Amino acid sequence: SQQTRVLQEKLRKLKEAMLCMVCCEEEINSTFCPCGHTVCCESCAAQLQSCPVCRSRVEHVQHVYLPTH
Amino acid sequence: SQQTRVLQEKLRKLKEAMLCMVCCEEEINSTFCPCGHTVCCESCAAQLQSCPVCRSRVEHVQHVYLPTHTSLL
Ligand SMILES: C[C@H](CS(N)(=O)=O)c1ccccc1
Ligand SMILES: [Zn+2]
Ligand SMILES: [Zn+2]
Ligand SMILES: [Zn+2]
Ligand SMILES: [Zn+2]
Numbered sequence: 001s002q003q004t005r006v007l008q009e010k011l012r013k014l015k016e017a018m019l020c021m022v023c024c025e026e027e028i029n030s031t032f033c034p035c036g037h038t039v040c041c042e043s044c045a046a047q048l049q050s051c052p053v054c055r056s057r058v059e060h061v062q063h064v065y066l067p068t069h
Numbered sequence: 070s071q072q073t074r075v076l077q078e079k080l081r082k083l084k085e086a087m088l089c090m091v092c093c094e095e096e097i098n099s100t101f102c103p104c105g106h107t108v109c110c111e112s113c114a115a116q117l118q119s120c121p122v123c124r125s126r127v128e129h130v131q132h133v134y135l136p137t138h139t140s141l142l
Contacts (some may be wrong), residue, residue: 001070001073002077003073004070006071006074006075006111007073007076007080010080011076011079011083012082014080014083014084014137015083017136017137018118018136018137021136023082028130028135031100031131031133033131034131035134036131036132036133036134037134038135039134039136041094053134057071061139062100062102062103062105062131063105063109063119064100064105064107065105065106065122066097067086067087067090067097067102067108068087068137069081
């Protein structure tokens, strides 16, 4: 029904929001510290000096284990 | 249809996986360091000396800003 289409759209947008903002292919599993932006996969995060969201210096990258993984 | 019910169930399980594993009421927004388990809201994370998944000692809690986050706004 049209309701099935609405739910498919919500599921798709939620799943897309869990993907890396840089490569768009891998799941987000890394946090820039200390700002806390958790927007990249480990490969894209490893190469950044500053947070791509807030420009704060990245002191280190913390790997995150999320239940949604 | 039956597929509407299947999709509602998938959506519910995905939304539940984003809720704190301790209180079940607030969104996950905190990481236990150094283990990395990201399973609690900031209120439950502040009260745990050991990670509830792996029992590693919590040295500190890192707040996480996730693109999936939602609010009353
Ligand atoms: C305990 C889980 C959360 S999870 N999968 O550990 O992150 C849960 C929370 C709220 C309702 C149902 C189930
Ligand atoms: Zn990436
Ligand atoms: Zn940042
Ligand atoms: Zn909680
Ligand atoms: Zn842990």
